[PDB]
CSV table of C-alpha atoms and ligand atoms in Angstrom, one decimal:
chain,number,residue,atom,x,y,z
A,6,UNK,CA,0.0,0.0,0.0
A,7,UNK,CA,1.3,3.7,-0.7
A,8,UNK,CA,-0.3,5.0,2.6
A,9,UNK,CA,2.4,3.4,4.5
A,10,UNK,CA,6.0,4.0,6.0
A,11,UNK,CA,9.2,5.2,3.7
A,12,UNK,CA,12.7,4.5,3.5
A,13,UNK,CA,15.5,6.1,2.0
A,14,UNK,CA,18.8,4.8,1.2
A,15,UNK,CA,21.3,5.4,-1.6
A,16,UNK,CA,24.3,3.6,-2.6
A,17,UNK,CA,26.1,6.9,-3.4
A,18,UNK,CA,26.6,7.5,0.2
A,19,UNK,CA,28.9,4.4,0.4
A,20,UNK,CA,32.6,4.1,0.6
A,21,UNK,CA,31.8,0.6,-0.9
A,22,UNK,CA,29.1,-1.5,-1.8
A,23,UNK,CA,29.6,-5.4,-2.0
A,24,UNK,CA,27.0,-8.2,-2.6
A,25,UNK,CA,27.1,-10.5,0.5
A,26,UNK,CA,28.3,-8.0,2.9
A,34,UNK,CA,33.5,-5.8,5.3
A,35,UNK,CA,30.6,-3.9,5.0
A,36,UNK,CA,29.7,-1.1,7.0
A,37,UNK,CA,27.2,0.3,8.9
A,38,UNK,CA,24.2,1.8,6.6
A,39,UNK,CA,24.7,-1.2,4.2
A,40,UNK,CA,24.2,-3.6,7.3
A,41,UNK,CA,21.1,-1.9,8.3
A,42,UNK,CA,19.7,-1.7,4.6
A,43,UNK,CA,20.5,-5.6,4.2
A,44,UNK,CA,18.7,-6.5,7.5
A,45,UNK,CA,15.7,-4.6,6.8
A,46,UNK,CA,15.8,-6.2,3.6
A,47,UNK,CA,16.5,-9.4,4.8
A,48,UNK,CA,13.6,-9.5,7.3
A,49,UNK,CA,10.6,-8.2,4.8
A,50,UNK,CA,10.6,-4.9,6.1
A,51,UNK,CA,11.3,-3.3,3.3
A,52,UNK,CA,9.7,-5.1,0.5
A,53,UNK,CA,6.0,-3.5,2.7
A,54,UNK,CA,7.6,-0.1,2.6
A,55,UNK,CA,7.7,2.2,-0.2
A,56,UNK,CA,11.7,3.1,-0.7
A,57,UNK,CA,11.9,6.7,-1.9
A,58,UNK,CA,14.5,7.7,-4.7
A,59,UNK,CA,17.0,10.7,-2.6
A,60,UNK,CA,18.8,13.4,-4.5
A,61,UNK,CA,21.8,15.7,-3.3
A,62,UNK,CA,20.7,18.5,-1.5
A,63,UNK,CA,20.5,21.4,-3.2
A,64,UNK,CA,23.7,24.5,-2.0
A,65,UNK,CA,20.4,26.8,-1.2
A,66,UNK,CA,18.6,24.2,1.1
A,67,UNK,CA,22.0,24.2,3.2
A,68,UNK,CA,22.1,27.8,3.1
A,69,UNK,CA,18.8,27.1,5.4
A,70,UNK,CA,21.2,26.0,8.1
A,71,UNK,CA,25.0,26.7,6.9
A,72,UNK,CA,27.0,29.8,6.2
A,73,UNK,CA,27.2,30.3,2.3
A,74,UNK,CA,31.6,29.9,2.3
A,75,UNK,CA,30.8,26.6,4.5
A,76,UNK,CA,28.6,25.0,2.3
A,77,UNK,CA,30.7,25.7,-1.5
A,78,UNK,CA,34.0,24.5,0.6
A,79,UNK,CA,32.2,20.7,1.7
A,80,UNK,CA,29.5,20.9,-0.8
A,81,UNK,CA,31.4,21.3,-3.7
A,82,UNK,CA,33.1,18.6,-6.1
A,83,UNK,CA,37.2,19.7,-5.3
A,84,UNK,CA,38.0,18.9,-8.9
A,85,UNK,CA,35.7,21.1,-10.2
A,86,UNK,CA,38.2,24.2,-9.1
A,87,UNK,CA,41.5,22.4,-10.8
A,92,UNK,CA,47.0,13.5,-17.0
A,93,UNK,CA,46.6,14.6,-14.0
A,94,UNK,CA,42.8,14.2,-13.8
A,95,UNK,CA,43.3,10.4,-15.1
A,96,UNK,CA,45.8,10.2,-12.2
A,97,UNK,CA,43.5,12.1,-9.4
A,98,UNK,CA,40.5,10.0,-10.5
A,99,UNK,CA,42.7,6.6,-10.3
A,100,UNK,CA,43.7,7.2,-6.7
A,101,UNK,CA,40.6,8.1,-4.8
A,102,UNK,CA,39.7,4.1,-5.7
A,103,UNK,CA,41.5,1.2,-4.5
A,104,UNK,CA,40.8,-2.3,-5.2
A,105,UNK,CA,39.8,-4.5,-2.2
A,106,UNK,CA,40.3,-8.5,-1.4
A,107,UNK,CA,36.5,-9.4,-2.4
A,108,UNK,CA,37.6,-8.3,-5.7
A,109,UNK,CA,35.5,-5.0,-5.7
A,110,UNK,CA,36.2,-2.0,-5.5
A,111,UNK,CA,35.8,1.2,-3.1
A,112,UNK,CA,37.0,4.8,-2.4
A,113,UNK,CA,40.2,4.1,-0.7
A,114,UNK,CA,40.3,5.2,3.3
A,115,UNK,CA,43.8,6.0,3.3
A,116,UNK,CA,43.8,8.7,0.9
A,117,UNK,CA,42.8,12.5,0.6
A,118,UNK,CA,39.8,11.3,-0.7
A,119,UNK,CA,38.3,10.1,2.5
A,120,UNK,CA,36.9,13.3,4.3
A,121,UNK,CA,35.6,14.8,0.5
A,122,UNK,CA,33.8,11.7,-0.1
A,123,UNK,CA,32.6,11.6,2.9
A,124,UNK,CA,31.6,15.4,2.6
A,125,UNK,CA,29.8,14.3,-0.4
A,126,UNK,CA,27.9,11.5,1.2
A,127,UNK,CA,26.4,14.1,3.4
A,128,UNK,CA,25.3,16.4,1.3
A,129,UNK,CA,23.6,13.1,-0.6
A,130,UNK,CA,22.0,12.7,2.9
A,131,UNK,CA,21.0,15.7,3.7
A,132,UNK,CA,18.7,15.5,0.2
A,133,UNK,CA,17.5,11.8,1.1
A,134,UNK,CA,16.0,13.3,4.4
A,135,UNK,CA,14.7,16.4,2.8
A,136,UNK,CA,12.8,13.8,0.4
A,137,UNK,CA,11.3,11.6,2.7
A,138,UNK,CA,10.5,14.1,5.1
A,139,UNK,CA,8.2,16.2,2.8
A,140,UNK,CA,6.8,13.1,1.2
A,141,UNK,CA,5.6,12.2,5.3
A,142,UNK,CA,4.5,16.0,5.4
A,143,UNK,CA,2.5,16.3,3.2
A,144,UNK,CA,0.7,13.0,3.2
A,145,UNK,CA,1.8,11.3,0.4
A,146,UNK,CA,3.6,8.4,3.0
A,147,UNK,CA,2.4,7.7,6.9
A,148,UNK,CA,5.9,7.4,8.3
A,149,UNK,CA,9.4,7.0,7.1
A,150,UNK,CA,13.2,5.8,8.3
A,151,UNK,CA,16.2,7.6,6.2
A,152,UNK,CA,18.9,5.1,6.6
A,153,UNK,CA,21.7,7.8,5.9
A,154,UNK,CA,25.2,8.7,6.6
A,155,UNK,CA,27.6,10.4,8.0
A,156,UNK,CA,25.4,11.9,11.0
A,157,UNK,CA,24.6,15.5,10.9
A,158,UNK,CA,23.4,16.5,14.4
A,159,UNK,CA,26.8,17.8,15.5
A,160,UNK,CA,27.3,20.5,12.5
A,161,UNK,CA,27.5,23.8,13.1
A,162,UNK,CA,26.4,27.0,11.0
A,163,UNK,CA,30.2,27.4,10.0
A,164,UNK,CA,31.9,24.3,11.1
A,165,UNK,CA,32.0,20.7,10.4
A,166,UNK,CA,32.8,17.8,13.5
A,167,UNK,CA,32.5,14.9,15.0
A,168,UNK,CA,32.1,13.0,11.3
A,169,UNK,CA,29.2,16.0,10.9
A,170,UNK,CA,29.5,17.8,7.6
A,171,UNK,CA,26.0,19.1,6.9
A,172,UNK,CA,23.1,18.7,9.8
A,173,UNK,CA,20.1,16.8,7.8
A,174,UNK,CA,17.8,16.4,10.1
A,175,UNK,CA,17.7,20.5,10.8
A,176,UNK,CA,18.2,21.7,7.2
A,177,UNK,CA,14.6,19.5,6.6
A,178,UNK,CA,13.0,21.4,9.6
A,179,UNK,CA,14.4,24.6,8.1
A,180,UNK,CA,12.6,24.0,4.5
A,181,UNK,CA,9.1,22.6,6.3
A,182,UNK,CA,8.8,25.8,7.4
A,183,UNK,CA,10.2,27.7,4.6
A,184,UNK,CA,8.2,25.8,2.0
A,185,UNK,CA,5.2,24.2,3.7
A,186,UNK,CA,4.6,27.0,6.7
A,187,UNK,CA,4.2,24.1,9.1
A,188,UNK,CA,3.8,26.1,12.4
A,189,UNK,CA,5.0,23.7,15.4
A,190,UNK,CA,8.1,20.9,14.6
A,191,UNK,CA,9.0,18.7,17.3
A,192,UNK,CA,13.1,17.6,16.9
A,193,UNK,CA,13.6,14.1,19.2
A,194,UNK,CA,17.3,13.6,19.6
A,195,UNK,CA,18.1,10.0,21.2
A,196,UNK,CA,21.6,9.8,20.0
A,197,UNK,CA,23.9,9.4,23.1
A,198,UNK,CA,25.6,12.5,22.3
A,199,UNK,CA,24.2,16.1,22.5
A,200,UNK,CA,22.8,17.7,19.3
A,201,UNK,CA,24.9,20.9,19.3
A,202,UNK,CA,24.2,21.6,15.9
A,203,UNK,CA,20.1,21.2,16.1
A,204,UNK,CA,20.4,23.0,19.5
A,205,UNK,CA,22.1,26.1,17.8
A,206,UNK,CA,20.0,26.0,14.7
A,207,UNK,CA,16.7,26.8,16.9
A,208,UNK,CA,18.1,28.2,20.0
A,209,UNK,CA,15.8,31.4,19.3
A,210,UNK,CA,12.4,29.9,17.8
A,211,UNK,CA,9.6,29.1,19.9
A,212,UNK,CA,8.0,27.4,16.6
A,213,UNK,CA,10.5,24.5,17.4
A,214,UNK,CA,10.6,22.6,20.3
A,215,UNK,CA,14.2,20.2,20.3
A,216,UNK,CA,14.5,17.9,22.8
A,217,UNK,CA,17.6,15.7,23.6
A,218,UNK,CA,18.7,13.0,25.7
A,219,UNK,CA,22.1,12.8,26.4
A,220,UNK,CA,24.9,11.2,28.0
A,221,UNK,CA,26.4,14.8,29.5
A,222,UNK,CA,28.0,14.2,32.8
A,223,UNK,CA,28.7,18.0,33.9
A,224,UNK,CA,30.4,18.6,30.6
A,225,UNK,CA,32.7,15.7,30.7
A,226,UNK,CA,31.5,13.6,28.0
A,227,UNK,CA,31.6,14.6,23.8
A,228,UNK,CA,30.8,17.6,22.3
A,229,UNK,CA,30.5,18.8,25.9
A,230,UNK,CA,27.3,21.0,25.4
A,231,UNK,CA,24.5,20.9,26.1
A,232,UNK,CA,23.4,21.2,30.0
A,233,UNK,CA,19.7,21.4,31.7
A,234,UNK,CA,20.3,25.1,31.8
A,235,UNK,CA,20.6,26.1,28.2
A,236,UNK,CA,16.2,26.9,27.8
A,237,UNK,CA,16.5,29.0,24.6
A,238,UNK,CA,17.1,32.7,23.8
A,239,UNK,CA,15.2,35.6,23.0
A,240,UNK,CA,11.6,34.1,21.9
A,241,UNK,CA,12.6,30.6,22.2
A,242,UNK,CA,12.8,30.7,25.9
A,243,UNK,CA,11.7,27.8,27.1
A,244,UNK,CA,11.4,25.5,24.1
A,245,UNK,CA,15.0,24.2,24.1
A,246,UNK,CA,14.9,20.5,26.5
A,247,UNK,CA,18.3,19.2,27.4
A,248,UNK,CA,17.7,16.2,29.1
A,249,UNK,CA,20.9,16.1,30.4
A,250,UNK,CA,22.4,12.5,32.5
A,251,UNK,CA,24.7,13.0,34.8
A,252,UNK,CA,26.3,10.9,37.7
A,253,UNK,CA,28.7,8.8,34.9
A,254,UNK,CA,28.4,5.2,34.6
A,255,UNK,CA,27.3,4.5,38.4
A,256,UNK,CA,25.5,2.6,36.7
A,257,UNK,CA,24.8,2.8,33.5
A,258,UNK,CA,21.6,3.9,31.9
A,259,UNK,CA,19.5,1.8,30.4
A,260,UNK,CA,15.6,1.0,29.8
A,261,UNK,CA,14.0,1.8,32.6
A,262,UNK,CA,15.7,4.9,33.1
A,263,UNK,CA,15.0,6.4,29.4
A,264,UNK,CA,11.5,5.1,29.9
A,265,UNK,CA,11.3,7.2,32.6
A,266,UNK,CA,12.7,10.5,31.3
A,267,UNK,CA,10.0,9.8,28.5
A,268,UNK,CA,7.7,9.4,31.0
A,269,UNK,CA,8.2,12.7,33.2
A,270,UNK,CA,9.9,14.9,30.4
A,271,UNK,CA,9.4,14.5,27.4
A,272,UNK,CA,5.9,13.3,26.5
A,273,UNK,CA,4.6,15.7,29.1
A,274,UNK,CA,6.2,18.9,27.3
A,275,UNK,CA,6.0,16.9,23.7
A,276,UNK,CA,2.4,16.9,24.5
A,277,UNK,CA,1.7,20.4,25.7
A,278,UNK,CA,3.9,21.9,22.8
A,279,UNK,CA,1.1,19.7,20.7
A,280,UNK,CA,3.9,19.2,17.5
A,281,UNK,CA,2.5,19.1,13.5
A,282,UNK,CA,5.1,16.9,12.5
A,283,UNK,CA,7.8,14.7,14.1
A,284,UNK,CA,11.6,14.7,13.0
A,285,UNK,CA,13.7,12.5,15.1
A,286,UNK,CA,18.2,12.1,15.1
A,287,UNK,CA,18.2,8.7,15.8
A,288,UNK,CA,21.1,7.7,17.2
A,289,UNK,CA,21.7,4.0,18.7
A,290,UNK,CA,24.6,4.9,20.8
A,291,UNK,CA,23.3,4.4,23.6
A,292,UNK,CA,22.1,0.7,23.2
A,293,UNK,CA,24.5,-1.8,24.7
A,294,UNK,CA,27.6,-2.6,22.8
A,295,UNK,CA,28.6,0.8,22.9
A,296,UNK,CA,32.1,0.8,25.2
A,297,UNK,CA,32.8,3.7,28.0
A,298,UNK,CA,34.2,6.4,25.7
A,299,UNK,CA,32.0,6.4,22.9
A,300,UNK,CA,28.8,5.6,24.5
A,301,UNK,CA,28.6,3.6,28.0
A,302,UNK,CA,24.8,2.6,28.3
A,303,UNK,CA,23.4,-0.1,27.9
A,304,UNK,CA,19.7,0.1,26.3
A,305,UNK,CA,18.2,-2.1,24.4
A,306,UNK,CA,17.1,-2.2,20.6
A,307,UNK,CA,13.6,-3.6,21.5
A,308,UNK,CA,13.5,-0.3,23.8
A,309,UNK,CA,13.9,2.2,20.8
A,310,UNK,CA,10.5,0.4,19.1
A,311,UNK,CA,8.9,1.5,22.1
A,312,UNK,CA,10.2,4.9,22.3
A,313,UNK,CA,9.8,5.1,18.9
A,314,UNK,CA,5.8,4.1,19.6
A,315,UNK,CA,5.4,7.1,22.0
A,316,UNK,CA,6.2,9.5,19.4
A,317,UNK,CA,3.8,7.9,16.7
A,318,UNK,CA,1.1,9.4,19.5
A,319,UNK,CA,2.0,12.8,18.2
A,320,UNK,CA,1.1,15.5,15.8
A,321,UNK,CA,-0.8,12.3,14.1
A,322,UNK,CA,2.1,10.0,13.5
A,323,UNK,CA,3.6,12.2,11.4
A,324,UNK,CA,7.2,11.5,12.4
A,325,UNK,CA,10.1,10.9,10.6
A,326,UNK,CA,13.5,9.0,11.9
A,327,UNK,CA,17.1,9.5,10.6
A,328,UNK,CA,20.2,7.4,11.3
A,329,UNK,CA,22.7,9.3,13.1
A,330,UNK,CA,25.5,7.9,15.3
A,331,UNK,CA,25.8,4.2,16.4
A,332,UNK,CA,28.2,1.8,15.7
A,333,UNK,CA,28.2,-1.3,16.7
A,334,UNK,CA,26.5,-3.5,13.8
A,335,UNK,CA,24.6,-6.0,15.8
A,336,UNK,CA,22.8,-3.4,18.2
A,337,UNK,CA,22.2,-0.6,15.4
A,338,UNK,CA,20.8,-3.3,12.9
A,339,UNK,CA,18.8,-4.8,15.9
A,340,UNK,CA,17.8,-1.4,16.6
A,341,UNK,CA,16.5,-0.1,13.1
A,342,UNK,CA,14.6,-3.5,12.5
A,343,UNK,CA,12.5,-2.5,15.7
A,344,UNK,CA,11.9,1.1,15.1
A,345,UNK,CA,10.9,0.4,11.5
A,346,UNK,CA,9.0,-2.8,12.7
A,347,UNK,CA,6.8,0.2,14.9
A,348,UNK,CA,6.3,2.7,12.3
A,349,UNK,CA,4.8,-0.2,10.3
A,350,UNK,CA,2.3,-0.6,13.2
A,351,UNK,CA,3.9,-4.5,14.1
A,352,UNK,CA,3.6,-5.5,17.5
A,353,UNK,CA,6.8,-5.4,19.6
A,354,UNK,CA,8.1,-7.8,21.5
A,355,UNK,CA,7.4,-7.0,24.9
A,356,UNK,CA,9.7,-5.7,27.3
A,357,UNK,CA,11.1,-8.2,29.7
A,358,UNK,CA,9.2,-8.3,33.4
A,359,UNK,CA,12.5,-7.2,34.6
A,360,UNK,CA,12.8,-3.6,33.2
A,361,UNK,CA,8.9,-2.9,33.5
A,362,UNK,CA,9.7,-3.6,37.5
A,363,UNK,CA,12.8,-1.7,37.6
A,364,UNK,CA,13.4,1.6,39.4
A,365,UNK,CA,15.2,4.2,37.4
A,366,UNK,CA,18.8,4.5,39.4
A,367,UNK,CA,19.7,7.5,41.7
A,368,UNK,CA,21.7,9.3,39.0
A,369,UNK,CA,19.4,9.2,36.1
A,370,UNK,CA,16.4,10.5,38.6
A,371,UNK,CA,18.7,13.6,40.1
A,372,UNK,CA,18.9,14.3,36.2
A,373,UNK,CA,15.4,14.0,35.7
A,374,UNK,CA,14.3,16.1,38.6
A,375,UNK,CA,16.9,18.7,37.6
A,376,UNK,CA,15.2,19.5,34.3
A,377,UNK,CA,11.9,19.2,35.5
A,378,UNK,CA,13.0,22.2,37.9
A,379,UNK,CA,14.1,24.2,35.1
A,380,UNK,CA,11.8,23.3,32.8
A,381,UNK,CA,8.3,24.2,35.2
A,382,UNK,CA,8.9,27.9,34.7
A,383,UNK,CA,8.1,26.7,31.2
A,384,UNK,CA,5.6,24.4,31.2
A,385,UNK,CA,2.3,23.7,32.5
A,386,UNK,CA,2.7,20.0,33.0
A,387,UNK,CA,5.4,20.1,35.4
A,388,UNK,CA,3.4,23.1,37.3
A,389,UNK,CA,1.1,20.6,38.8
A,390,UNK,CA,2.5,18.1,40.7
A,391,UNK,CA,5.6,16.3,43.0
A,392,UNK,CA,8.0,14.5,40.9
A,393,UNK,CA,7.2,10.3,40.6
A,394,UNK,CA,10.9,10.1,38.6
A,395,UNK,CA,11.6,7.8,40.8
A,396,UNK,CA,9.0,5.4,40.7
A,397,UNK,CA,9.1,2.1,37.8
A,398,UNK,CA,6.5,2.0,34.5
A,399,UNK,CA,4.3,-1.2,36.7
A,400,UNK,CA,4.7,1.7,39.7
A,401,UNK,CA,3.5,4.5,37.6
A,402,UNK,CA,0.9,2.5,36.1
A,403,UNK,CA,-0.5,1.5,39.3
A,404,UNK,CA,-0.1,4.3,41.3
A,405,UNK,CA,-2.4,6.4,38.4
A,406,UNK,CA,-5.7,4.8,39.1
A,407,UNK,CA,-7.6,5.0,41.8
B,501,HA3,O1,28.5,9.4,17.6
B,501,HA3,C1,29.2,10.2,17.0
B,501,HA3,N1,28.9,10.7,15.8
B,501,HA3,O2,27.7,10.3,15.2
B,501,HA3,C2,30.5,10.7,17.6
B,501,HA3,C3,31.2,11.7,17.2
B,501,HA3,C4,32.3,11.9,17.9
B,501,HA3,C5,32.5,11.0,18.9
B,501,HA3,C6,33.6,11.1,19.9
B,501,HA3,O3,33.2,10.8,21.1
B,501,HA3,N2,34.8,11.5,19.7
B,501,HA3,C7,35.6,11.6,21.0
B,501,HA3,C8,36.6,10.4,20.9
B,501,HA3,N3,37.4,10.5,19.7
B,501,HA3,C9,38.6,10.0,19.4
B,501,HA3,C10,39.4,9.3,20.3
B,501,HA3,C11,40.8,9.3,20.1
B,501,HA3,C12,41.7,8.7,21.0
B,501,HA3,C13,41.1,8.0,22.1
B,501,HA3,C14,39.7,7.9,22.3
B,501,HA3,C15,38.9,8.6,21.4
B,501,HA3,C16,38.9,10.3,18.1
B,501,HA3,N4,37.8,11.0,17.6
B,501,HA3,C17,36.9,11.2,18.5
B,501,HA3,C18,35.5,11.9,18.5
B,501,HA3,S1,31.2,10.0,18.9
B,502,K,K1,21.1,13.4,21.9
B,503,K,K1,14.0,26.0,20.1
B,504,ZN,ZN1,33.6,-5.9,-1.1
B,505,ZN,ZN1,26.5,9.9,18.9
């Protein structure tokens, strides 16, 4: 059916593609959701490179024609550049060699390939033409600044779409999601000073002590936007780790509450799966699970009428992202999930995560009506919550 959820991919992004992928992450993801049916009831969407005006939305104008543009273009000696970038590989195929030059343009490239993909689905969601939609896209985006590219970030997709819904289709009230494990310092700057989008993040932050190193519960907005910039911010290290119960909970308390009141028109969500386990103490340190991101994923269907998009932003490990997008696709398909185990619906979010919690529910009731109300229950588990609703 054509009323149903898109994806986007495009071999173009790749270093190297290779049947019976050695292979990396996006091709891993695409193969698993083809692999398990998913995508065959899906409608895949054709992407396009985005065009150098529709990252202008976001990024300075000398940013954008320094990454955006083919190097060559500005410059025998093209038979001899064009015969290095490739390098032939023990399969017997052949990629865009990682040792060269090469690397970081193609890579530049690849983003601003992604960057179009997202664009694509994203309106095709908006404007009713598909239900739901996953962009399975590299590199990430959520960490690129107006003027400067970092970590792997050349050109921020997921804001650059937000940018041209409201540019192109009016649409008054975006909700951004961010559930990579890192902050969105890019998004976060993009918005700091609109009320008309509320971003939201969950992060790994530590009291500044973990990558990028932004992002704390005190950075609400500017001017306008005062109040509809949510950094929910975990801190306390890895004593223990977070994981289901207490992201569950921060939904619970944080961000459906304010997701809710803000009352979004469409969903855009930087999906990240660096925080599911398999993630190692520097670069991530939790330990969710991928069946937990289908439920998460489920809560945000209940807004601005399921129109929500997701795109692939960090993650690494291939088992837990390719676990992971097979269960937040399996959701926007309307599926059922496989339940959560008896033990995380029983557990109690630790002490650090509800300190964290309570912290940016503090902040955040000058703000918001829904945290006016009432005594904090952070603390208590879903079964507990559930329970102690009633009667
Ligand atoms: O998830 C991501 N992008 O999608 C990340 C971007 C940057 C990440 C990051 O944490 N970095 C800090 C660690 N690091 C390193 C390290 C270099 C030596 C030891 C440990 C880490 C190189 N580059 C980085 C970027 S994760
Ligand atoms: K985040
Ligand atoms: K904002
Ligand atoms: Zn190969
Ligand atoms: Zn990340």
């Amino acid at each position: 059916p054509r009323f149903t959820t898109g994806l986007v991919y495009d071999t173009l992004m790749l270093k190297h593609q290779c049947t019976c992928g050695h292979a990396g992450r996006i091709q891993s993801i695409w193969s698993r959701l083809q692999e398990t049916g998913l995508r065959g009831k899906c409608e895949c969407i054709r992407g396009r490179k985005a065009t150098l005006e529709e990252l202008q939305t976001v990024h300075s104008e000398a940013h954008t024609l320094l990454y955006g543009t083919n190097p060559l273009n500005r410059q025998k000696k093209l038979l001899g550049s064009l015969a290095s970038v490739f390098v032939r590989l023990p399969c017997g195929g052949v990629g865009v060699d990682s040792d060269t030059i090469w690397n970081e343009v193609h890579s530049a490239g690849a983003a601003r390939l992604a960057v179009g993909c997202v664009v694509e689905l994203v309106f095709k969601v908006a404007t009713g033409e598909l239900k739901n939609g996953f962009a399975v896209v590299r590199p990430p985006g959520h960490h690129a600044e107006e003027s400067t590219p970092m970590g792997f970030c050349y050109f921020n997709s997921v804001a650059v779409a937000a940018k041209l819904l409201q540019q192109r289709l009016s649409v008054s009230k975006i909700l951004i999601v961010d559930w990579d494990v890192h902050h969105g310092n890019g998004t976060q700057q993009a918005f700091y000073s609109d009320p008309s989008v509320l971003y939201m993040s969950l992060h790994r932050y530590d009291d500044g002590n973990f990558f990028p190193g932004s992002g704390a519960p005190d950075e609400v907005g500017t001017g306008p936007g005062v109040g509809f910039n949510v950094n929910m911010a975990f801190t306390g290290g890895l004593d223990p780790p977070m994981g289901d119960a207490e992201y569950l909970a921060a939904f619970r308390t944080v961000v459906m509450p304010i997701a809710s009141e803000f009352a979004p028109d469409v969903v855009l969500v930087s999906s990240g799966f660096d925080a599911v386990e398999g993630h190692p103490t520097p670069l991530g340190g939790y330990n969710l699970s991928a069946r937990c991101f289908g439920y998460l994923t489920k809560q945000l269907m209940g807004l601005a009428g399921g129109r929500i998009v997701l795109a692939l932003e960090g993650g690494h490990d291939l088992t837990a992202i390719c676990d992971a997008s097979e269960a937040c696709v399996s959701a926007l398909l309307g599926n059922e999930l496989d339940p959560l185990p008896e033990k995380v619906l029983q557990q109690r979010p630790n002490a650090n995560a509800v300190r964290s919690m309570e912290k940016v529910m503090e902040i955040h009731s000058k703000y918001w009506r829904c945290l006016q109300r009432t005594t904090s229950t952070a603390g208590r588990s879903l079964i507990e919550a559930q329970t102690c609703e009633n009667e």
